[PDB]
Chains A and B, each alone.
Chain A
Amino acid sequence: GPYHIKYAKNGTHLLITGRKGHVASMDWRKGQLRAELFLNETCHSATYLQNEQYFAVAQKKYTFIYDHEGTELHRLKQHIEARHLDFLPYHYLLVTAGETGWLKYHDVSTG
C-alpha cells in the first residue's frame, strides 16, 4: 500500500496500483484476475485505455502500456516522472503530468 484505484468507463473492471508496485487488473463482479504485476518499483497511478484490454502504469520515471494479460507493450520514454494519468475516450489521447510541470498528450491509436 497505499492503493490507487481506477474503474473502467463502463464499471466492469477495476485497476489497482499499490505504491510499492503491486498492479492488478480484475473483473470485480465475477472475481476474475485479468492481470497482476509485481513490479519492484514505485507506482503512482494507473488508468485504463479505450477498454479493459490495455492499461497504463506511471512507474518511477516512465509510463508503461500493458496488455490484458499483463504483457508490456510500450515504454513511453517521452513521458518523464508522470504522477497523474487520464484518458480521453473519444479522442484516444493519454494525458500525463508530474514533477516536470509538462502536460503531454499521447495518441494511443497511432502512438
Chain B
Amino acid sequence: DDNMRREVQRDLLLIKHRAALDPKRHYKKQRWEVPERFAIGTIIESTILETLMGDEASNKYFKRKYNEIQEKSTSGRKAHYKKMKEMRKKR
C-alpha cells in the first residue's frame, strides 16, 4: 500500500544498510533497490528495528562508533576556526 508504514519503511532501510549493523558480518557487495512487491513475515517454529535496539552490545557499539565519526566530521570546522581566532585574543 502507498501508506508505507513507518515501521515497514525503517525495516527496509535497515536491510539496505545491513552491512553496518554488526562489524563482523561483511556481506556481499550489492545495492538492493526496494522491490516493487514484497511481503513481510515472521519465522514459525518484535520488529527488526525493535529487536536490534533492544540489544545492549549493538547500542553501545553505535554510540561509540557514531561519536568517533563526529570527531572526524567536526575537525577543522567552524568550531575549530573560532578557537584559533580566540587564541589571538589576549584572554
Q: Do chains A and B touch in the complex (CB under 8 A)?
A: no
